[PDB]
Design an enzyme around this catalytic site. Structure first.
Site, PDB file in Angstrom:
ATOM      1  CD  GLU A 153       1.590  -1.376   2.251  1.00 19.56           C
ATOM      2  OE1 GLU A 153       2.057  -0.433   2.938  1.00 19.56           O
ATOM      3  OE2 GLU A 153       1.939  -2.579   2.403  1.00 19.56           O
ATOM      4  CG  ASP A 157      -1.092  -6.251  -3.034  1.00 19.87           C
ATOM      5  OD1 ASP A 157      -0.970  -5.631  -4.118  1.00 19.87           O
ATOM      6  OD2 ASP A 157      -0.139  -6.827  -2.475  1.00 19.87           O
ATOM      7  CG  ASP A 186       0.623  -8.339   1.634  1.00 21.08           C
ATOM      8  OD1 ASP A 186       1.071  -9.482   1.407  1.00 21.08           O
ATOM      9  OD2 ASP A 186       1.362  -7.382   1.917  1.00 21.08           O
TER      10      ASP A 186
END
Length: 542
Positions: A247, A280, A283
């Site tokens: 993630e 990302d 974040d």
């Protein structure tokens, strides 16, 4: 001798002498050496009796699930811990041998293999990232939940140094003043690699990730939930490197988790690097009506006074967004984002200042509408755009100092200005002219409205050029112009109205406007006298 030995030797117990870890823990006084691999069951809990211990690991903790350490005294240190799952799960590897990202669901499914590293276990977020993968993944590759996690629970002042592992995770639950120092590149599992979760009790404080690096993992490398470093900014990530997070590299949670807030305030995010995250780089948003936090009536959505100290961050190769955040009244500085597939920066900020930002070759796969987006009324001072490959959409922001080969029609800001430049020189290379163009975006975002040019007369080394001042007419740039020294004639070429000039064509008093009178082959002049009255005179005749 016993009396003497007892007073002159360093105390340490070693796991090889005990059947269980709790037994070793109970016998420990100062040091505890993990000298043999230990297979633990999920949920196995060790009570350290409040002792300030120095745990030296020279073997592995093997098991799927959590090994829970509780009641370690303030000042305890755990060094060299290695977590490894017993299960070898199915992992996907969304990149090629040339390190190109794979975006096609079928191509990603084809990378499936059983391994404890060099890939990660698919999660629901992958269903969004690689559309259609949900229906293509074989059932045995879906819903896996393998992680060998060291959970430190409700402890204060405990530091974990040089930790590593395979399908490894580190969870600080309800901890304060704890640090993850110099992580020795653990390869992540299904859960966050380093998580500071403080949903119960007081807001987490003094929790840090200092130095080190992590690789892989299905979700974010570093995650914070309900932490507040206070005005002292006691907490955060400093000098860390995240590689290939399933993630994001670093994430502060947003919204309600359970019945309370998972948001974070007053943390530092500095001198860190995030490379190749599937989502990302950073974040740092807090909003996605706020139980346990500021009500929406006090602070609207995306306008919380997060107050993070953010400086000197580098992001490269994100398949998602390089740098993302929200909040109001923020100061952000020295951010460098390069080669990202989605937006380099996605900023849902208001009344914030961004200083010295470099967004180089982002949104390369058109995942977003722009390379950098800013929603609220912000200030950008120093913005470098374009590497070698809208660019910026910040409708309510004021910007100064853009550098780079940007296409001006791809810029949308509220105000752009260079108020404090000194004497200027425009240096032209590879062209027969130098130019200073003017473009009124309200008129046209694609055509320059006027220009000041200098053009070569003859060729190189002629020592002659002509200067021309232009204006757009009929959507044709440079349609009308005044020239000085064309063909080295040393005179000014002046444009006149091609027909009878109307009274309203002249603007100021004590000015004249030449116009053509075709019926007499004469040049006339509409004159606005010093007193404001108009008169038409004959200027030139046969």
């Amino acid at each position: 001798y016993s009396i003497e030995a007892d007073k002159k030797f360093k105390y340490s117990v070693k796991l090889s002498d005990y059947p269980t870890l709790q037994d070793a823990a109970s016998a420990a006084v100062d040091g505890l050496l993990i000298d043999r691999d230990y297979n633990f069951y999920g949920g196995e809990t060790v009570d350290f009796g409040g002792k300030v211990l120095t745990i030296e690991c020279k073997a592995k903790f093997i098991g799927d699930g959590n090994l829970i350490f509780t009641k370690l005294g303030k000042g305890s240190r755990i060094a060299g811990v290695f977590m490894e799952s017993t299960t070898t799960p199915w992992v996907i590897k969304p990149w090629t041998d040339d390190n190109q990202w794979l975006t096609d669901a079928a191509a990603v499914v084809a990378t499936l293999k059983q391994s404890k590293t060099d890939g990660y276990q698919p999660t629901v977020s992958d269903y969004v990232k690689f559309p259609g993968i949900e229906t293509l993944l074989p059932p045995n590759a879906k819903g896996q939940n393998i992680t060998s996690t060291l959970e430190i629970r409700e402890c204060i002042g405990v530091e974990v140094h040089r930790a590593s592992g395979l399908m490894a995770g580190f969870l600080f639950r309800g901890c304060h003043f704890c640090k993850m120092v110099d992580a020795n590149n653990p390869s992540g599992g299904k859960d966050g690699i380093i998580t500071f979760e403080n949903l119960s009790g007081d807001w987490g404080k003094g929790n840090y990730v200092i130095g080190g690096r992590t690789s892989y993992g299905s979700v974010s490398s570093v995650q914070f939930l309900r932490n507040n470093g206070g005005f002292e900014r006691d907490g955060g990530v400093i000098g860390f490197t995240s590689y290939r997070a399933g993630e994001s590299g670093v994430k502060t949670w947003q919204g309600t988790v359970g019945s309370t807030t998972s948001r974070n305030y007053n943390l530092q995010f500095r001198d860190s690097v995030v490379i190749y995250p599937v989502w990302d780089g950073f974040d740092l948003g807090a909003d996605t009506d706020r139980p346990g936090d500021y009500p929406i009536t006090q602070y609207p959505l995306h306008q919380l006074p997060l107050n993070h100290l953010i400086d000197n961050l580098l992001v490269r190769g994100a398949l998602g967004v390089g740098f993302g955040m929200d909040g109001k009244g923020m100061y952000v500085s020295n951010i460098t984002v390069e080669d990202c597939a989605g937006s380099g920066a996605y900023l849902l900020t208001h009344e914030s200042v961004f200083t010295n930002i470099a967004i180089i070759d982002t949104n390369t796969k058109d995942f977003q509408a722009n390379q950098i987006y800013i929603s609220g009324a912000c200030r950008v001072n120093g913005l470098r755009l374009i590497g070698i490959r809208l660019t910026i959409d910040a409708p309510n922001s004021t910007v100064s100092g853009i550098t780079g080969m940007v296409d001006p029609s791809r810029i949308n800001v509220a105000n752009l200005a260079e108020e404090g430049l000194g004497n200027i020189r425009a240096n032209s290379f590879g062209y027969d002219s130098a130019a200073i163009k003017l473009r009124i975006h309200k008129l046209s975002k694609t055509l320059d409205s006027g220009a000041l040019y200098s053009h070569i007369n003859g060729g190189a080394g002629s020592g002659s050029a002509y200067t021309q001042l232009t204006a757009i007419s009929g959507s044709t740039p440079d349609a009308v112009s005044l020239k000085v020294n064309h063909k080295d004639c040393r005179g000014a070429e002046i444009p006149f109205v091609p027909d009878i000039a109307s009274d309203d064509f002249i603007k100021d008093s004590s000015c004249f406007l030449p116009y053509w009178e075709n019926n007499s082959t004469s040049l006339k002049a509409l004159v606005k006298k010093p007193n404001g009255e108009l008169v038409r005179l004959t200027l030139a005749t046969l």
